[PDB]
């Protein structure tokens, strides 16, 4: 169906390479980058929302990054 949980959660560890190893790093980066490239307005909105939340600078930056990661996945 639609969900189909990923097996990388329970990755089997051994010397030999797993099923689809070479695509793990690129996969997530490409998804996030493509979504952000299509929608910059949400980058602005997330910057604003992160600025409103969190006292210190580091808290606001972390909020910005976590929003920018949650948005593409609709997690």
């Amino acid at each position: 169906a639609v969900t189909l949980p990923s097996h990388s959660t329970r990755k089997l560890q051994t010397r030999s390479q797993t099923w689809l190893e070479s695509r793990e790093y690129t996969k997530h980066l490409i998804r996030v980058e493509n979504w952000i490239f299509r929608n910059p307005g949400f980058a602005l909105a997330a910057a604003a929302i992160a600025w409103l939340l969190g006292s210190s600078t580091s808290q606001k930056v972390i909020y910005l990054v976590m929003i920018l990661l949650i948005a593409p996945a609709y997690s």
Partner: protein
């Protein structure tokens, strides 16, 4: 047909092959202690060539 979603859903799953009713895995992990006390040296008492 769903058969491409499962291929992507599979990641970090090991590849195996199968001969008849038996399945060969080529990636594993075994622990063996080597009792090496009945090994000798064949060459002892040989005149050097």
């Amino acid at each position: 047909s769903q058969e491409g979603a499962v291929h992507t859903a599979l990641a970090g799953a090991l590849e195996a092959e199968m001969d008849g009713a038996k399945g060969r895995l080529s990636s594993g992990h075994l622990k063996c202690r080597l009792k090496m006390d009945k090994l000798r040296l064949k060459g002892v008492s040989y005149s050097l060539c």
